[PDB]
Structures are given as structure tokens and as C-alpha cells.
Design a protein around this ligand. Structure first.
Ligand SMILES: O=c1cc[nH]c(=O)[nH]1
Lengths: 220, 50
DNA sequence: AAGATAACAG
DNA sequence: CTGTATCTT
């Protein structure tokens, strides 16, 4: 009913999407065909049926994009940061930080993809199994096309990782409010000091928008 | 690391956006300097210099 | 580009 | 031990 398909040469063959994405689907297909064979040589996180599942999200109700680098080196589900287990480092830190911010102290898990206002995103859509950033070379032009498309819709873009996103503006035509923070899996304890979730709500008020309710993310 | 001091700055910017009277030159200075700071730090923000 | 670095879980 | 980014040459 909002869900169109489109087809591609290599796995996963169909890509389903929501109308909000229609403008990009042509170039995406063209691009994915030029590289898929090559990237598919590797086992990947997530599996190929999951590379695009985040295209089923609408954009018109979104005012914040929370953008990671690429999937978990292992056990990616296709939803950025999602750990069905609540075992991954990165979602744990994020969950702590929301806890401090909100007062919620008892929770089973956390998921960024059930939060009104918010689209969690991964800049690159896959990696070779166990190797962070291994597929950057393949996703490159596609990564830039989708992010630019996402940022037309949202007020605030929050990038998780100083290394990979310090040059993010060069990546986009069109200015958008952009915050670059430490990644949750930083190897000192730098994400514990990040105030970026508060910082988003203050930025949202300054653009006359409703604050994100970060508590919505908890799984009880 | 520096995002606390970024928060503090943004809060003050928002506090001024709300409090600010055009007759008060010191507030406009402070506000305009926060909007510049904010604009260049986050690339774009929802408020303008006055 | 290469190497040193940090800390915590498992 | 290995698995999970940052910063300075
Ligand atoms: O999906 C994910 C998982 C971990 N780190 C990221 O940047 N993205």
C-alpha cells in the first residue's frame, strides 16, 4: 500500500521500499548492480536480505538521523545498532547514556528504531564478516546518495564516530545541522562523557521542533 | 569531552532567544556571538543573527 | 599509512 | 589473549 518493490541482478534480488525513498531507487539500482557481485564474494554482516530493510522506514515523520559507520562486525540485523540480545558494546553504552539522561534504570534492552522522530542509519550498508569498514570501497557512491536523501528530511544529523565522520560535510551538498560525537565503542571512556542526546533536543527546540523522547527506546 | 561545554552554550543560546529584547545591546551581542558559534560548529541551526 | 593507545567483557 | 575507535607522527 505504501510498499513498492524493484529488482536487482544479484542478491537479495528484490529491494522493498516506502514511497519517501522513490527518488533514489533508480540510481541505487544502477549502483548496486555495478558492485554487488564484488561485495557478495564475502560473508557479510548483516546478511544480504537485510542490507536494505531500513528502506521500509518513512522519512517525512523524521527529524533526527542517528548515523553509524557500518554494521556490527558480527551479527548485524540490518537495523543500525540493534542487538536482539542486548549483547553488543555499542547499544549498551547508548542505553546507559539514555538511562542517565532520563532516569530509567530498569530495562532489558534498547533499540533506536522504535523512537518517534528518529531514523537510525549506517553510512555503509555492510561489512565483510568480522572486519569493520571492509566494504567502504563498494558502498561509497551509494552511501553518499542515501545520506543526502535522508538529510533533506531531518533537522538534525548525529554521527557516531570522530574518525569516520570528521569530514562528513564534504560528503553532502546542502547544509544540515550536524553533530559529530565519539562512537560508543571508543576505547577510552569517551562516550560516557558525550552529551549529544541532550544536545539534539536543544538543537531541535532552536529549529522549533518537538524534542525526541529517548525513553521510547527502552525494551522492558 | 567538549560536548558539555557545547551543551552549556546551546542552552544559553536558547535562553537568550527567549529572553532577548531588541532594546538590550549587550544581549544582542552575546546572542549574535552564540549564533555564529553555533552555526559554524553545527553547520546550520534553526535561528538567525538579529 | 603506520603505529601506539586505552579500557572493559568474555 | 581477542573483539569492540582515536590521535599523532
Ligand atoms: O549498526 C552499527 C553497529 C555498531 N556501530 C555502528 O556504527 N553501527
Amino acid at each position: 500500500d505504501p510498499m513498492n518493490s524493484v529488482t536487482v541482478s544479484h542478491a537479495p534480488y528484490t529491494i522493498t521500499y516506502h514511497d519517501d525513498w522513490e527518488p533514489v531507487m533508480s540510481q541505487l539500482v544502477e549502483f548496486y548492480n555495478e558492485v554487488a557481485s564484488w561485495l557478495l564474494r564475502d560473508e557479510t554482516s548483516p546478511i544480504p536480505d537485510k542490507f536494505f530493510i531500513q528502506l521500509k522506514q518513512p522519512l517525512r515523520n523524521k527529524r533526527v538521523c542517528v548515523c553509524g559507520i557500518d554494521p556490527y562486525p558480527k551479527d548485524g540485523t540490518g537495523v543500525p545498532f540493534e542487538s536482539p540480545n542486548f549483547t553488543k558494546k555499542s547499544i549498551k553504552e547508548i542505553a546507559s547514556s539514555i538511562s542517565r539522561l532520563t532516569g530509567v534504570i530498569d530495562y532489558k534492552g534498547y533499540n533506536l528504531n522504535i523512537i518517534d522522530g528518529v531514523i537510525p542509519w549506517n553510512y555503509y550498508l555492510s561489512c565483510k564478516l568480522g572486519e569493520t569498514k571492509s566494504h567502504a570501497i563498494y558502498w561509497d557512491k551509494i552511501s553518499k546518495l542515501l545520506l543526502q536523501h535522508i538529510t533533506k528530511h531531518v533537522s538534525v544529523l548525529y554521527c557516531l564516530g570522530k574518525t569516520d565522520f570528521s569530514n562528513i560535510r564534504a560528503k553532502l551538498e546542502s547544509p544540515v545541522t550536524t553533530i559529530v560525537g565519539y562512537h560508543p565503542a571508543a576505547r577510552d571512556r569517551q562516550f560516557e562523557k558525550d552529551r549529544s542526546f541532550e544536545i539534539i533536543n536543544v538543537l531541535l527546540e532552536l529549529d522549533n521542533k518537538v524534542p525526541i523522547n529517548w525513553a521510547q527506546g527502552f525494551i522492558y | 569531552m567538549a560536548s558539555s561545554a557545547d551543551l552549556t552554550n546551546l542552552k544559553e543560546l536558547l535562553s537568550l532567544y527567549k529572553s532577548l529584547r531588541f532594546s538590550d545591546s549587550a544581549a544582542i551581542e552575546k546572542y549574535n556571538s552564540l549564533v555564529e558559534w553555533g552555526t559554524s560548529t553545527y553547520w546550520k541551526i534553526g535561528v538567525q543573527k538579529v
